[PDB]
Design a protein around this ligand. Structure first.
Ligand SMILES: [Cl-]
Length: 248
């Protein structure tokens, strides 16, 4: 059981997820922030298990009325829910009620919404604790879902240990993580992979981001400002980058 997965944007039709699957089983999963199949150069997912994701309450691209049908047609083993509701003006009670209505009926493994690493009350893990209070046992889930961006491996380690200390019986997936712009992304992931591989309560982790610098600059310039291009798992030619090599 590897834990590694691809955070695979909507704009990745040029790239092949199989490039980061060398058959040694470290890379096992792919998600694309949507409920439609990853856009790839191969028509497949390179042997990786696709995890659907209802990242907004409803969108043109992931209409929530189609969430059950898409899961059934595509046979996901796992589904992810809202993307960073903690900073997008969704109340813990609104999320709980939407989650019970729309996600609960998918009879597979389920993740509560991805929250940010914010220490603010009503954001991050505080927002998540308030959503779990609102659910009061009525949200069916398997995982909690973390994001992290910061400036040091030490801060990242402290944050995952803090999440485990708050939710010690919970299983964690890390759907997005990298250093902010200027950090040495290679040194970070070289620390972070063996650390996360050693935690029995972390099931999956997805470096931000399994694309190329050119596609991230073309489609997501805000991400290039925030993270730079050093965390892109792909090269501009579709090969593995210095960070992609760490995935094997
Ligand atoms: Cl974060």
């Amino acid at each position: 059981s590897g834990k590694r997965g691809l955070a695979w944007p909507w704009y990745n039709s040029p790239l092949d997820p199989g490039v980061l699957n060398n058959g040694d089983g470290e890379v096992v999963a792919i998600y694309d922030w949507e409920t439609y199949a990853p856009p790839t150069s191969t028509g497949g997912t390179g042997g990786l298990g696709f995890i659907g994701m209802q990242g907004t309450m409803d969108s043109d691209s992931s209409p929530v009325a189609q969430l059950a049908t898409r899961q059934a047609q595509q046979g996901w083993a796992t589904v992810f829910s809202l993307n960073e509701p903690d900073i997008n003006g969704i109340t813990p009670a609104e999320a709980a009620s939407w989650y019970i209505e729309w996600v609960n009926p998918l009879a597979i493994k389920k993740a509560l919404p991805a929250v940010t690493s914010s220490t603010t009350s009503g954001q991050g893990l505080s927002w998540l604790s308030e959503m779990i209070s609102a659910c009061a046992g009525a949200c069916y889930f398997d995982y909690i879902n973390l994001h992290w961006y910061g400036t040091s491996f030490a801060e990242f380690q402290a944050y995952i240990e803090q999440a485990h200390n708050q939710f010690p019986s919970y299983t964690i997936v890390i759907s997005e993580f990298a250093l902010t712009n200027g950090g040495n992304q290679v040194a970070f992931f070289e620390s972070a992979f063996p650390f996360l591989d050693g935690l029995s309560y972390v099931l999956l982790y997805f470096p931000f981001v399994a694309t190329s610098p050119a596609l991230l600059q073309a489609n997501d310039p805000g991400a290039v400002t925030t993270v730079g291009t050093g965390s892109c798992l792909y090269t501009n030619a579709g090969g593995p980058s210095s960070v992609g090599n760490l995935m094997y």
